[PDB]
């Protein structure tokens, strides 16, 4: 029994296998039933194998054959246009996977030498995100809020917004999606995968899918299988951005299979490593320097906080990892606020080196009227008299709140949003009516495109505002408002 | 056969030690001998040292240590097919009306693995409910996902049984109705309106199957009887290839069960005591009611809010299953506005413009912009009142108000202790109505004309009676 | 007369207005002592399944 | 050892004991000193034996012997007028019981089919409950509400009240009384039983009582075995109604043994399957098909909230249990409006169908009155029509008090309700309400006994005789 | 302190803090695994203020004549009177010096809160 064992006990989806003597630990093993599981505990006397599948087959006095192998995980182009299980095997229905090669789930993340600071922007194309909270590619941007605030539609857009450079030439621009749906039922995900082929967003993109029926080990290790497909493209000189949706049931399952195996419970009874769990996962996002090929590897975890409590274990865990905050809130998505972003709480740290120059320039001032905005409000909440300048902080930031707001699956290029930033900070606004301001964007925007399309030209091919192109995006921005 | 020994009871638990070493598979039914007839016991664990642990699907009560145990050879297996129909049936399958054996020539096991992800299909279809509350603001999909959530003596089986009344005879398909740990008399009035209205029919073709494991039953028949619902329902969904209904209340029930047993099966208790596995079990049930490609199934479910908190670990693993939600709330319910839908917190996917269209989508929105400004207004009105707000504020406020009284609704079930006659309102009706009040076209109409009326028609002909 | 009046009016709304936040209080006190009294309980649970494991 | 044991280890009221092979799960057993036990736990060469009693009494090496019987307790008709602890032992001092026969402490509630829908009322004698929260023969209706607030004045009486009819000669109508004190000081229970002796009511009640000291398994146990008390009746074709009194102490009880069983403390540190605890007890509370012989149990559970609080845990799961609630509020209780009945949040879902036929014309729609009533207040918190619903209101809400052990009969009631819902009070000052009410009712005695007696009668009202009495009413309201 | 009280002398002792040796009481506890109470600290922990302030006394003329003065020191996170330590260590005192933030940073030292301070002695004590 050095390289075979037989079950002691089974059962709630973990086996103890005596023998087994030459394991690794994390090494994977197969049932004489053909279910493979993971060796997580190695004891004294016992094995603790925790199953990628239903223990119906398993059973007392099952003969167990060590498999000498670490998880590993397919990895290479090839995967691109496939959902793929948290082992890497297809399940869209579609032919084999054309692996260019195998990667460990577990790895050491690049340490300090290799890496490079972060200063290329990952163009979201949202206008909140990217003139208030930027993320840059090796960037790591939580994303986080209560149920149904819109976590995942964030994520998507951003996603879909790549299209524009993803069909050219230049494969220093291609970004590649990869999306981890952890805990999420099967429909959600064929309902997302139909999103992404009507947009054609999925040419580019790859699932990696860890469903709720998927046993607990599963949803476990498909993040890290996922940021081994992901880390391909960053090791080869691409650019790669990896959505964790959902990071909070990954720690669930966690949770699970530390219980049953026994190992002492944590606060919330979550294990006492949960956090070298998700910083181990975190760190894996990088922006590599030029000896190693300038590839980057961004993630945007998604953290789903219960009635809006960010002091829970994970959540505070994760926001200490990641370099930054989109808050989303209930109160918002109802005033009609759609992303629904908190500005006030969501924060980038690694903040305007990986925003456009563009705008960077236009979105100067814009932070700082949203903060006097949301200071002043209690005023007219409260019933007291307003000032006059207070009266123009509220015609300012209602109109600068109304202009940040954005319809679903409907992202906008930067030469489109330095206009509309550029019209709202300048008071450009203020006289038109509050409905008015989805009228005034739409318009403005086919107005440029008509007769100023030399300004959005140059914007994009330049991303920096000139004084020749700021003081023309003045001029047309006076002649529109001169409607 | 295979046969054992009783070596320990406790609760619903019970230890079976097989001399012969070839053991029963997990999820195995066992059979005990009993005056009352046949004890079936469900195989859960592998102890070692050829014993097995197991949950009672019946009182383990009068158990005796060395009681013999034999291994019927695979799992808890139900009847299948229109056998089925207009008929109640329990958790290990046996009928209960007593109307003598199910006569079904296939019987199928009650654990089945979910379809696989090739075999999901996803539509965007309306189901029109005629609710005024869920129609506008959270509609309904067919072949979606539904979860109604809502703490005790909120209108949850109200609610259920008006979904029940008006959907049903609409589908024309199949229905099957899934008791889990719910209430017995409601059992008895579900089935005797059912034969009533002739969706049952004893002398004849019925529509639905009944499966009851109602909250007189020990947790292990709680925790089993929602997957013999799934397996009726699957049955005609896959090998009948119909249209399906599948009611379930209650399924927390399901879930709290397990909890039930999780401590006396030696786990290790997660957090606020529920049990480790509680995120796969609620996967492992739920996603096999899913539609597919062979047929769909139109689910609605009930869920329990355990002292009105929605953090609680299962209301909240079990939002993520869904595609409509309807949030009733004790809030609501106790200004008396039934049915208590929380129009904030019902949320629904359909909610789409490229759904419902662009008219739909803005007259929703518009409403509940309208009611979270008054729900934002809240502290100033109680402690400065109403004459302190801006002008503007005032007239979304009244208009709040009346919104909030406009969306209560009769319905039929609740006539016998509401006294109110049961009312139902179309979808465009609704729409229109509610366009109607944002624009201010019924701003000179009292509020309480508002309260407890189907369509705007409802509310001017009330606005006559109380100018009368 | 109209000065007389909105100074009256001022001292009986401030009076309301007070009497209205006191019952608030009440009721926010009411609140805040059951959530005092689950906290506890759910630490204290977290600390005897962390020794009882 | 197969009918005999040992005691291994006693504590925290659980006794560890060696032997007893052949017991039966759940079965009683009697110890050397004469104290009785559970047989909880079956575990491979041991037994947890869980004490009706202090263990004090047990002590190792002390022999423990089997009975035979899963945990019962006498029934039968001869409890009538006895109390008794939770295990049926007299304990009034009055002498032995004359059993009927003997059933288990639990028991699986009737199925779906024996069933049959609640249509008969529970007459409580109370305007307020009788009028907006009826309450039906097979019904289980929630009593909730904060400390001293007259939870046990309303089910009291609501038991008092059946003295009209179990003095008569048919059991279509009697309605034999099970009350469990759970928790109570033994005082409380002592004066409680000689109130009912003082009225009468003892004669056809039964009081089974687990007061505070007793060990926490009787505490738990006494609602089974009242239970089971209850239903002999319930199965026999009599009508029983059960009182709770309360079930937070029983649930109080069974965490207290959960936790010393060390189980893992769920939400309020109560085990998980407190909510089974309540629910198998109150779905035995039933109305029978004619083939089950038409008898029924109607149950009146108790809770104490803390600060008014309806979304606890054990508050919550009760109301999901029950077929309404009754919610009776401290802050009526103090203005003196008692019953003190929160009409908003009291409903009972069995409704109109328990209802007598004469209430639900004459209240027909008061229900809604009184809400909008408080809506007004809060409104005011004016227009015409607002001010005379106001009106209205204070002198309907008027009508509503009343005082302790009077119950009205039906055929009282109707009248004052009809003169409240049709407007004859809107012209009598409040303070002489109370004084209407008397003189109103003694008038109608007095001069139109036919009326009251048709009324009682038929049931009904038909045009005749809503007619009379509009002209009767009309007549005293002028006079 | 008890030599000097004992012998006939006056003594002031001064325990900084007492909060410390709380923390500390809770360590050596849950490190031998005895059973946690509230907020982790061990069930005896009333019980280890009480058998540590009780001893400072004012002894009668028969018991000689000595007193041992006690002033522990109480560290409130936040300014949370409230929380489990110092309710028992508040309950055990015959008063409190409280000390407040607001009026330390508005230069109002030594900062004592007379509102809330207390002496329990009280006038008994004070100079004439
Ligand atoms: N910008 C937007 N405009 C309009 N509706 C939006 C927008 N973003 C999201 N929504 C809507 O909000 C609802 C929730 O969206 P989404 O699924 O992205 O949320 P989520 O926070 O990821 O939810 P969950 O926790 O359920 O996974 C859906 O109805 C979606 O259509
Ligand atoms: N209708 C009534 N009129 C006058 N006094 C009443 C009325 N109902 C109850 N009381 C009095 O109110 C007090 C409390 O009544 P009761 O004992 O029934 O309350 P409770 O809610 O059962 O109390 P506890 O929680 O202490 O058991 C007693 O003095 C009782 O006499
Ligand atoms: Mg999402
Ligand atoms: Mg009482």
């Keep these: 029994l050095n390289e075979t064992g037989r079950v002691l006990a089974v059962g709630d989806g973990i086996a103890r296998v005596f023998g087994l003597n030459n394991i690794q630990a994390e090494e994977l093993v197969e049932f004489s039933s053909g279910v493979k599981g993971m060796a997580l505990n190695l004891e004294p006397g016992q094995v603790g194998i925790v199953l990628f599948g239903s223990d119906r087959l398993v059973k007392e006095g099952e003969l167990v054959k060590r498999t000498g192998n670490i998880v590993d995980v397919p990895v290479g182009p090839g995967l691109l246009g496939r959902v793929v299980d948290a082992l890497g095997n297809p399940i869209d229905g579609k032919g084999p996977i054309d692996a260019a090669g195998r990667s460990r789930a577990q790895v050491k993340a690049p340490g300090i030498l290799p890496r490079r600071s972060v200063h290329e922007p990952v163009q979201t194309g949202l206008k909140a ?45 291609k970004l590649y999606c990869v999306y981890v749906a952890v805990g999420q039922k099967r429909s959600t995900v064929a309902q997302l995968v139909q999103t992404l082929e009507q947009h054609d967003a999925m040419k580019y993109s790859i699932i990696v899918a860890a469903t709720a029926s998927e046993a607990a080990p599963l949803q476990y290790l498909a993040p890290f299988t996922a940021a081994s497909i992901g880390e391909w493209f960053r090791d080869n000189g691409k650019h790669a951005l990896i959505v964790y949706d959902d990071l909070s049931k990954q720690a669930v399952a966690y949770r699970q299979l530390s219980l049953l195996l026994r190992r002492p419970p944590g606060r919330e009874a979550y294990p006492g490593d949960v956090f070298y769990l998700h910083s181990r996962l975190l760190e894996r996002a990088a922006k590599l320097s030029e000896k190693e090929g300038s590839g980057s590897l961004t993630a945007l975890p998604v953290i789903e906080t219960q009635g809006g409590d960010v002091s829970a274990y994970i959540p505070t865990n994760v926001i200490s990892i990641t370099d930054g905050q989109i808050f989303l809130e209930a109160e918002l998505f109802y005033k009609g606020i759609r992303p629904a972003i908190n500005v006030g709480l969501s924060v980038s740290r690694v903040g305007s080196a990986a925003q456009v120059k563009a705008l960077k320039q236009v979105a100067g001032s814009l932070k700082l009227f949203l903060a006097q905005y949301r200071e002043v409000a209690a005023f007219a909440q409260f019933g007291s008299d307003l000032d006059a300048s207070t009266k123009q902080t509220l015609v300012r930031g209602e109109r600068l709140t109304q202009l940040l707001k954005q319809n679903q699956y409907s992202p906008l290029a930067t030469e489109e949003q330095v206009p509309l930033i550029y019209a709202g900070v300048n008071g450009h606004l203020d006289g038109i009516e509050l409905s008015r301001i989805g009228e005034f964007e739409s318009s403005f925007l086919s107005y440029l495109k008509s007769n100023h399309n030399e300004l959005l030209t140059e914007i994009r091919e330049k991303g920096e505002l000139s004084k020749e192109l700021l003081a023309s995006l003045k001029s047309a921005t006076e002649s529109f408002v001169a409607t | 056969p295979i046969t054992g020994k009783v070596t320990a009871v406790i609760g619903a638990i019970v230890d079976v030690h097989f001399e012969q070493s070839e ?58 097919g229109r056998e089925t129909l207009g008929r109640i049936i329990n958790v290990i399958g046996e009928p209960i009306d007593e109307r003598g054996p199910i006569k079904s020539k296939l019987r199928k096991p009650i654990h089945a693995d979910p379809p696989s992800f090739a075999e999901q299909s996803t539509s965007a279809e309306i189901l029109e409910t005629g609710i005024k509350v869920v129609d506008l603001l959270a509609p309904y999909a067919r072949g979606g996902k539904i979860g109604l959530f809502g703490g005790a003596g909120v209108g949850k089986t109200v609610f259920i049984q008006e979904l029940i009344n008006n959907i ?133 479910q009930a869920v329990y809010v355990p002292a009105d908190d929605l953090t609680d ?71 400065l009142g109403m004459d302190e707000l801006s002008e503007q504020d005032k007239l979304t406020v009244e208009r709040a108000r009346k919104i909030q009284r406009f969306l209560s609704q009769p319905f039929a079930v609740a006539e016998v202790f509401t006294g109110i006659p049961g009312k139902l309102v179309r979808l465009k009706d609704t729409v229109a109505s509610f366009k109607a009040v944002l624009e201010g076209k019924y701003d000179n109409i009292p509020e309480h004309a508002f309260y407890m009326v189907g369509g705007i028609e409802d509310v001017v002909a009330k606005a006559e009676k109380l100018a009368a | 007369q109209g000065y007389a009046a909105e100074i009256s009016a001022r001292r009986n709304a401030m009076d309301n207005a007070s009497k209205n936040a006191g019952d608030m209080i009440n009721r926010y006190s009411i609140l805040y002592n059951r959530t005092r009294q689950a906290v506890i309980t759910n630490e204290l649970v977290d600390i005897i399944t962390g020794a009882s494991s």
């Design chain 2, 23 to 80: 053991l029963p598979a997990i999820l195995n039914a066992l059979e005990i001998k009993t005056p009352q007839g046949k004890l079936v016991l469900e195989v859960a664990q592998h102890l070692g040292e050829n014993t097995v642990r197991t949950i009672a699907m019946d009182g383990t009560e009068g158990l005796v240590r060395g009681e013999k145990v034999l291994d019927t050879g695979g799992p808890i297996s139900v009847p299948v």
């Design chain 2, 313 to 383: 670990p299962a209301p909240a693993t079990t939002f993520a299953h869904l595609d409509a939600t309807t949030v009733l709330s004790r809030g609501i319910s106790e200004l008396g506005i039934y049915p208590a839908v929380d129009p904030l917190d019902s949320k629904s996917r359909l909610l789409d413009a490229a759904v419902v269209g662009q008219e739909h989508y803005d007259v929703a929105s518009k409403v509940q912009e309208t009611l979270q400004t008054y729900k934002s207004l809240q502290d100033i009105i109680a402690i």
């Design chain 2, 168 to 300: 049903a005879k609409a589908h024309g398909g199949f229905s099957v109705f899934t008791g889990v740990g719910e209430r017995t008399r409601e059992g008895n009035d579900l089935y005797r309106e059912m034969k009533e209205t002739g969706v049952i029919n004893l002398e004849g073709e019925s529509k639905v199957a009944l499966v009851f494991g109602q909250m007189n039953e020990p947790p292990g028949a709680r925790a089993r009887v929602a997957l013999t619902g799934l397996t009726i329902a699957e049955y005609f969904r896959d090998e009948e290839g119909q249209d399906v209904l599948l009611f379930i209340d209650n399924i927390f029930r399901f879930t709290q069960a397990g909890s039930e047993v999780s401590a006396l099966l030696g786990r290790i208790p997660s957090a606020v005591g529920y049990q480790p596995t509680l995120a796969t079990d609620m996967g492992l049930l739920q996603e096999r009611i899913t539609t597919t490609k062979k047929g769909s199934v139109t689910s609605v």
């Design chain 1, 129 to 173: 995100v990217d003139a208030l909270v930027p993320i840059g590619r090796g960037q790591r941007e939580l994303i986080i809020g209560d149920r149904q605030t819109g976590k995942t539609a964030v994520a998507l857009d951003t996603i879909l917004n790549q299209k524009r450079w993803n069909n050219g030439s230049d494969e220093s621009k």
